[PDB]
Amino acid sequence: PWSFKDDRGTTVKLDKVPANIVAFTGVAAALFDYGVEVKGVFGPTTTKDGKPDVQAGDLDVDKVTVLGNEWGKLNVEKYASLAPEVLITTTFDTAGTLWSVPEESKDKVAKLAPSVAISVFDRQLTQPLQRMWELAESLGADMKAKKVTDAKAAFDKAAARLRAAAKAKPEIRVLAGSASPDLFYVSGTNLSVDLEYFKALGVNFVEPSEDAKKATGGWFESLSWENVDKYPADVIIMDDRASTIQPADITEGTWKQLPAVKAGQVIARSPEPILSYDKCTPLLDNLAEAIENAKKVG
Ligand code: NA
Ligand code: NA
Ligand code: NA
Protein backbone atom coordinates (compact mmCIF):
# COMPACT_ATOMS: atom_id res chain seq x y z
CA PRO A 1 0.00 0.00 0.00
CA TRP A 2 1.20 3.50 -0.91
CA SER A 3 0.15 6.81 0.61
CA PHE A 4 1.41 10.39 0.15
CA LYS A 5 0.00 13.67 1.45
CA ASP A 6 0.86 16.35 -1.11
CA ASP A 7 1.33 20.15 -0.90
CA ARG A 8 -2.39 20.76 -1.38
CA GLY A 9 -2.94 18.72 1.83
CA THR A 10 -4.53 15.90 -0.20
CA THR A 11 -3.59 12.31 0.56
CA VAL A 12 -3.41 9.82 -2.33
CA LYS A 13 -3.81 6.22 -1.15
CA LEU A 14 -3.30 3.34 -3.58
CA ASP A 15 -3.33 -0.41 -2.90
CA LYS A 16 0.27 -0.66 -4.12
CA VAL A 17 3.18 1.58 -5.06
CA PRO A 18 2.26 3.03 -8.51
CA ALA A 19 4.08 1.42 -11.43
CA ASN A 20 2.42 3.68 -14.04
CA ILE A 21 3.52 7.15 -12.98
CA VAL A 22 2.87 10.11 -15.31
CA ALA A 23 4.69 13.34 -14.46
CA PHE A 24 5.47 16.84 -15.57
CA THR A 25 8.80 16.57 -17.38
CA GLY A 26 10.77 18.47 -14.72
CA VAL A 27 9.19 16.31 -11.97
CA ALA A 28 10.07 13.11 -13.88
CA ALA A 29 13.61 14.46 -14.16
CA ALA A 30 13.88 14.95 -10.35
CA LEU A 31 12.49 11.48 -9.65
CA PHE A 32 14.96 9.93 -12.13
CA ASP A 33 17.91 11.19 -10.01
CA TYR A 34 16.50 9.19 -7.06
CA GLY A 35 16.04 6.04 -9.19
CA VAL A 36 12.27 6.35 -9.72
CA GLU A 37 11.14 5.64 -13.31
CA VAL A 38 8.08 7.30 -14.81
CA LYS A 39 6.03 5.89 -17.73
CA GLY A 40 4.80 9.14 -19.27
CA VAL A 41 5.80 12.78 -19.25
CA PHE A 42 4.26 16.07 -20.27
CA GLY A 43 6.13 19.35 -20.72
CA PRO A 44 9.19 20.66 -22.62
CA THR A 45 10.91 17.31 -23.21
CA THR A 46 12.85 17.40 -26.46
CA THR A 47 14.27 20.28 -28.49
CA LYS A 48 13.72 20.69 -32.23
CA ASP A 49 16.86 18.59 -32.93
CA GLY A 50 15.46 15.81 -30.69
CA LYS A 51 17.89 16.47 -27.82
CA PRO A 52 16.63 16.50 -24.21
CA ASP A 53 15.20 19.84 -23.07
CA VAL A 54 16.90 21.33 -19.98
CA GLN A 55 13.73 20.30 -18.03
CA ALA A 56 14.24 16.62 -18.98
CA GLY A 57 17.44 16.50 -16.90
CA ASP A 58 18.97 13.02 -17.30
CA LEU A 59 15.75 11.27 -18.49
CA ASP A 60 16.04 8.77 -21.31
CA VAL A 61 13.65 10.71 -23.51
CA ASP A 62 13.40 7.90 -26.04
CA LYS A 63 12.21 5.39 -23.44
CA VAL A 64 9.47 7.48 -21.80
CA THR A 65 6.14 8.23 -23.50
CA VAL A 66 5.91 11.95 -24.29
CA LEU A 67 2.26 13.14 -23.90
CA GLY A 68 2.95 16.79 -24.63
CA ASN A 69 6.23 18.47 -25.62
CA GLU A 70 5.63 21.98 -24.30
CA TRP A 71 3.95 23.55 -21.27
CA GLY A 72 0.16 23.20 -21.12
CA LYS A 73 -0.12 20.19 -23.46
CA LEU A 74 -1.22 16.65 -22.56
CA ASN A 75 -2.98 14.30 -24.98
CA VAL A 76 -5.84 12.85 -22.94
CA GLU A 77 -6.31 9.71 -25.16
CA LYS A 78 -2.61 8.91 -25.01
CA TYR A 79 -2.55 9.52 -21.28
CA ALA A 80 -5.46 7.10 -20.81
CA SER A 81 -3.56 4.49 -22.90
CA LEU A 82 -0.82 4.35 -20.25
CA ALA A 83 -3.19 3.00 -17.50
CA PRO A 84 -2.03 5.93 -15.35
CA GLU A 85 -1.97 5.21 -11.63
CA VAL A 86 -0.86 8.69 -10.47
CA LEU A 87 -0.09 12.07 -12.02
CA ILE A 88 2.67 14.16 -10.41
CA THR A 89 3.39 17.80 -11.06
CA THR A 90 4.37 21.10 -9.46
CA THR A 91 2.12 23.98 -8.38
CA PHE A 92 2.70 27.70 -8.57
CA ASP A 93 -0.23 29.17 -6.62
CA THR A 94 -2.33 29.10 -3.44
CA ALA A 95 -5.10 27.24 -5.28
CA GLY A 96 -2.91 24.19 -6.01
CA THR A 97 -3.38 24.50 -9.78
CA LEU A 98 -1.66 21.53 -11.42
CA TRP A 99 1.19 22.96 -13.43
CA SER A 100 1.11 22.28 -17.16
CA VAL A 101 -2.09 20.14 -17.04
CA PRO A 102 -4.14 21.84 -19.80
CA GLU A 103 -6.83 24.13 -18.36
CA GLU A 104 -9.26 22.94 -21.07
CA SER A 105 -8.98 19.21 -20.25
CA LYS A 106 -7.97 19.25 -16.57
CA ASP A 107 -11.30 17.77 -15.38
CA LYS A 108 -11.08 14.93 -17.93
CA VAL A 109 -7.48 14.29 -16.89
CA ALA A 110 -8.43 14.15 -13.16
CA LYS A 111 -10.97 11.35 -13.81
CA LEU A 112 -8.26 8.97 -15.01
CA ALA A 113 -5.91 9.00 -11.99
CA PRO A 114 -5.31 10.87 -8.75
CA SER A 115 -2.71 13.63 -8.63
CA VAL A 116 0.16 14.69 -6.45
CA ALA A 117 1.26 18.37 -6.42
CA ILE A 118 4.61 19.63 -5.05
CA SER A 119 4.46 23.39 -4.46
CA VAL A 120 7.05 25.75 -5.81
CA PHE A 121 5.07 28.81 -4.67
CA ASP A 122 6.28 31.40 -2.16
CA ARG A 123 8.93 29.39 -0.30
CA GLN A 124 12.67 28.77 -0.52
CA LEU A 125 14.07 26.04 -2.85
CA THR A 126 15.06 23.80 0.11
CA GLN A 127 11.35 23.15 0.90
CA PRO A 128 10.26 21.57 -2.40
CA LEU A 129 13.67 19.79 -2.52
CA GLN A 130 12.81 18.16 0.82
CA ARG A 131 9.25 17.36 -0.30
CA MET A 132 10.43 15.78 -3.59
CA TRP A 133 12.90 13.72 -1.48
CA GLU A 134 9.99 12.54 0.75
CA LEU A 135 7.88 11.69 -2.31
CA ALA A 136 10.72 9.65 -3.87
CA GLU A 137 11.29 7.84 -0.56
CA SER A 138 7.57 6.97 -0.31
CA LEU A 139 7.83 5.43 -3.81
CA GLY A 140 10.64 3.06 -2.69
CA ALA A 141 13.75 5.02 -3.76
CA ASP A 142 16.91 4.14 -1.84
CA MET A 143 17.77 7.48 -0.26
CA LYS A 144 20.98 6.09 1.32
CA ALA A 145 22.46 5.20 -2.06
CA LYS A 146 25.92 6.77 -2.48
CA LYS A 147 24.76 8.77 -5.54
CA VAL A 148 21.94 10.36 -3.47
CA THR A 149 23.95 11.21 -0.35
CA ASP A 150 26.82 12.54 -2.52
CA ALA A 151 24.38 14.81 -4.36
CA LYS A 152 23.02 16.20 -1.09
CA ALA A 153 26.59 16.80 0.24
CA ALA A 154 27.58 18.65 -2.99
CA PHE A 155 24.41 20.80 -2.82
CA ASP A 156 25.26 21.95 0.70
CA LYS A 157 28.84 22.88 -0.37
CA ALA A 158 27.48 24.79 -3.39
CA ALA A 159 25.10 26.71 -1.14
CA ALA A 160 28.06 27.63 1.09
CA ARG A 161 30.02 28.72 -2.01
CA LEU A 162 27.20 31.04 -3.10
CA ARG A 163 26.84 32.51 0.42
CA ALA A 164 30.61 33.25 0.40
CA ALA A 165 30.52 34.79 -3.09
CA ALA A 166 27.57 37.07 -2.20
CA LYS A 167 29.31 38.20 1.02
CA ALA A 168 32.68 38.71 -0.78
CA LYS A 169 31.16 40.73 -3.67
CA PRO A 170 28.21 42.75 -2.16
CA GLU A 171 28.43 45.35 -4.96
CA ILE A 172 27.46 42.90 -7.77
CA ARG A 173 23.81 43.45 -8.80
CA VAL A 174 22.00 40.41 -10.26
CA LEU A 175 19.01 40.88 -12.55
CA ALA A 176 16.69 37.91 -13.22
CA GLY A 177 15.36 38.21 -16.78
CA SER A 178 13.28 36.35 -19.38
CA ALA A 179 13.01 37.29 -23.07
CA SER A 180 10.02 37.12 -25.43
CA PRO A 181 9.31 38.93 -28.71
CA ASP A 182 6.85 41.38 -27.15
CA LEU A 183 8.46 41.94 -23.73
CA PHE A 184 11.48 41.55 -21.49
CA TYR A 185 10.39 40.35 -18.06
CA VAL A 186 12.22 41.19 -14.83
CA SER A 187 11.53 38.89 -11.92
CA GLY A 188 11.66 39.97 -8.30
CA THR A 189 12.87 37.41 -5.81
CA ASN A 190 9.59 37.04 -3.90
CA LEU A 191 7.44 33.99 -4.85
CA SER A 192 10.17 32.13 -6.82
CA VAL A 193 11.77 29.16 -5.02
CA ASP A 194 15.23 29.61 -6.61
CA LEU A 195 15.42 33.39 -6.18
CA GLU A 196 14.03 33.34 -2.59
CA TYR A 197 16.79 30.89 -1.65
CA PHE A 198 19.51 32.84 -3.49
CA LYS A 199 18.36 36.04 -1.72
CA ALA A 200 18.40 34.25 1.65
CA LEU A 201 22.01 33.25 0.86
CA GLY A 202 22.79 36.98 0.49
CA VAL A 203 22.73 37.57 -3.29
CA ASN A 204 22.13 41.27 -4.19
CA PHE A 205 19.20 41.23 -6.67
CA VAL A 206 17.64 43.98 -8.72
CA GLU A 207 14.13 44.15 -7.22
CA PRO A 208 11.31 45.73 -9.21
CA SER A 209 8.88 47.50 -6.85
CA GLU A 210 5.78 45.60 -5.71
CA ASP A 211 3.97 48.25 -7.65
CA ALA A 212 5.81 47.34 -10.88
CA LYS A 213 4.90 43.65 -10.44
CA LYS A 214 1.23 44.07 -9.51
CA ALA A 215 -0.06 43.13 -13.03
CA THR A 216 1.16 39.54 -12.33
CA GLY A 217 0.15 39.56 -8.66
CA GLY A 218 3.75 40.07 -7.56
CA TRP A 219 5.83 37.74 -9.80
CA PHE A 220 7.44 39.99 -12.40
CA GLU A 221 7.53 43.30 -14.21
CA SER A 222 6.94 43.48 -17.98
CA LEU A 223 9.35 45.88 -19.81
CA SER A 224 9.35 47.14 -23.37
CA TRP A 225 12.63 46.14 -25.02
CA GLU A 226 13.59 49.81 -25.38
CA ASN A 227 13.53 50.09 -21.51
CA VAL A 228 15.66 47.02 -20.62
CA ASP A 229 18.35 49.37 -19.28
CA LYS A 230 15.85 50.66 -16.61
CA TYR A 231 17.76 48.87 -13.84
CA PRO A 232 21.58 48.89 -13.69
CA ALA A 233 22.81 45.26 -13.54
CA ASP A 234 26.22 43.59 -13.33
CA VAL A 235 25.16 39.96 -13.84
CA ILE A 236 22.00 38.97 -15.77
CA ILE A 237 20.49 35.52 -15.20
CA MET A 238 18.23 34.63 -18.15
CA ASP A 239 15.33 32.18 -18.19
CA ASP A 240 16.41 28.94 -19.95
CA ARG A 241 12.98 27.47 -20.73
CA ALA A 242 11.70 26.44 -24.16
CA SER A 243 9.03 29.16 -24.15
CA THR A 244 11.67 31.94 -24.03
CA ILE A 245 14.31 33.50 -26.23
CA GLN A 246 17.81 32.47 -25.19
CA PRO A 247 20.44 35.20 -24.76
CA ALA A 248 22.58 34.09 -27.73
CA ASP A 249 19.50 34.59 -29.93
CA ILE A 250 18.38 38.04 -28.75
CA THR A 251 18.68 40.57 -31.61
CA GLU A 252 17.20 43.66 -29.88
CA GLY A 253 19.72 46.52 -29.91
CA THR A 254 19.05 47.77 -26.39
CA TRP A 255 19.84 44.31 -25.03
CA LYS A 256 23.09 44.15 -27.01
CA GLN A 257 24.20 47.50 -25.55
CA LEU A 258 23.68 46.50 -21.86
CA PRO A 259 26.95 46.70 -19.90
CA ALA A 260 26.52 43.14 -18.49
CA VAL A 261 25.89 41.80 -22.00
CA LYS A 262 28.98 43.55 -23.45
CA ALA A 263 31.12 42.31 -20.54
CA GLY A 264 29.96 38.67 -21.06
CA GLN A 265 28.29 38.51 -17.62
CA VAL A 266 25.08 36.76 -18.70
CA ILE A 267 24.33 33.20 -17.51
CA ALA A 268 21.30 30.90 -17.32
CA ARG A 269 18.55 31.00 -14.71
CA SER A 270 16.30 27.95 -14.37
CA PRO A 271 12.97 29.43 -13.12
CA GLU A 272 11.63 25.84 -12.88
CA PRO A 273 14.44 23.99 -11.06
CA ILE A 274 14.40 20.24 -11.37
CA LEU A 275 13.75 19.35 -7.72
CA SER A 276 16.66 17.02 -7.06
CA TYR A 277 19.74 18.03 -5.12
CA ASP A 278 21.76 16.93 -8.14
CA LYS A 279 20.08 19.32 -10.59
CA CYS A 280 19.97 22.28 -8.15
CA THR A 281 23.73 22.12 -7.38
CA PRO A 282 24.79 23.69 -10.72
CA LEU A 283 22.20 26.47 -10.14
CA LEU A 284 24.17 27.45 -7.05
CA ASP A 285 27.67 26.91 -8.58
CA ASN A 286 26.78 28.78 -11.82
CA LEU A 287 25.50 31.82 -9.92
CA ALA A 288 28.41 31.71 -7.44
CA GLU A 289 30.91 31.63 -10.34
CA ALA A 290 29.20 34.58 -12.12
CA ILE A 291 29.35 36.68 -8.91
CA GLU A 292 32.92 35.62 -8.02
CA ASN A 293 34.22 36.82 -11.41
CA ALA A 294 31.83 39.69 -12.32
CA LYS A 295 33.03 43.26 -12.70
CA LYS A 296 30.75 46.08 -11.57
CA VAL A 297 29.58 47.45 -14.97
CA GLY A 298 25.88 48.45 -14.82
NA1 NA B 1 10.06 4.91 -27.21
NA1 NA C 1 11.99 2.97 2.00
NA1 NA D 1 37.18 36.52 -8.83
UniProtKB/TrEMBL annotation:
Q: Which InterPro entries match?
A: ABC_transptr_periplasmic_BD, Bact_iron-sidero_bind
UniProt superkingdom: Bacteria
Does the record carry Signal as a key word? Answer: yes
Main localization, broad class: other
Q: Which UniProt keywords apply?
A: Signal, Transport
Which Gene3D superfamilies does the record associate with it?
Nitrogenase molybdenum iron protein domain (3.40.50.1980)
Residue ranges the record marks as coiled coil: none
Residues covered by the Fe/B12 periplasmic-binding domain: 19-295
**What PANTHER family does this protein map onto?**
FERRIC ENTEROBACTIN-BINDING PERIPLASMIC PROTEIN FEPB, IRON III DICITRATE-BINDING PERIPLASMIC PROTEIN
The protein's name in its UniProt record: Secreted protein
Lineage, highest ranks first: Bacteria, Bacillati, Actinomycetota, Actinomycetes, Kitasatosporales
